Structure 1
Amino acid sequence: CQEITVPLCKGIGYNYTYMPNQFNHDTQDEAGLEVHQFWPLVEIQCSPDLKFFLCSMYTPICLEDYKKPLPPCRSVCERAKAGCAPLMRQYGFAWPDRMRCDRLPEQGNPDTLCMDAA
């Protein structure tokens, strides 16, 4: 575990993250340098979930009781894409292929455990 160092992800839901991340980053600063390219889309606040999904993906949570990775559920990703995606595509920004939502576990499975609201 390490401590969240990226501004946008402080107080996103967890204070502890691991490295390397799902994006294969050395330091938290490296993951922040990449997630910062979304800052426009963040300021627009095109989706409330976008910040949580992108922060669970670039600096995933690190827990001292659960040592298996914990990704956001597929619905959170599909919701951030549903809300944010139309503007970015309309301006030529594809939902990033690493961020694809069919690559994530779905909520409601003890085997596929994820983070979401009920």
Structure 2
Amino acid sequence: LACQEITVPLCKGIGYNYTYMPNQFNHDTQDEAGLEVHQFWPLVEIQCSPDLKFFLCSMYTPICLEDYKKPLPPCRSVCERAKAGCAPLMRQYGFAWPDRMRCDRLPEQGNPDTLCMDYN
């Protein structure tokens, strides 16, 4: 409910400053979320996808708006761009795209039931 400022270093500077908790992963405090998304920092650093960072935080530190309080996830397209760019890397070591970033759970542009974040 309450919008709290984003503290996790990775997700500072992504274009929105305010999140809420708990997120979709039942992270109770924003630090607990942080200690997971920061495991992705090497992937952000390699620049396999230029959407990776925004996509990650759009799930771990979801945008929180004073004006509008309905769901606002990333669009499936954002995730799909990120998966296209970075899953190959993880596969070279035998790892699948993580279950938590499964893109098919996310809405597409034009969903009546909910809006979604992506550029155009």
Cα offsets for 1:59-105 (capped at 9, x unmatched) = 10000111112100000000000001101111223211121111000
SS in 2 for 1:64: coil
What TM-score, normalized to structure 1? 0.95
Gaps of 5+ in 2: none
SS in 2 for 1:47: coil
How far apart are the structure 2 equivalents of 1:46 and 1:55? 16
Q: Does 1:34 align with 2:36?
A: yes
How far apart are the structure 2 equivalents of 1:93 and 1:5? 29
Gaps of 5+ in 1: none
Q: 1:13: how far off?
A: 1.8
* CA RMSD in angstroms, aligned pairs only: 1.0
Cα contact 2:72–2:114 (8 A) shared by 1: no
Q: Which residue of 1 aligns with 2:96?
A: 94
Number of aligned residues:
118
| Structure 1 stretch displaced more, 46-55 or 89-98 | 89-98
Q: Does 1:52 align with 2:54?
A: yes
Cα contact 1:74–1:102 (8 A) shared by 2: yes
What TM-score, normalized to structure 2? 0.93
SS in 2 for 1:69: coil
Q: 1:45: how far off?
A: 1.2
How far apart are the structure 2 equivalents of 1:13 and 1:92? 33
Q: 1:23: how far off?
A: 1.4
| Structure 1 stretch displaced more, 103-112 or 2-11 | 103-112
Cα contact 1:4–1:15 (8 A) shared by 2: yes
Runs of 4+ in 1 over 3 A off after TM superposition: none
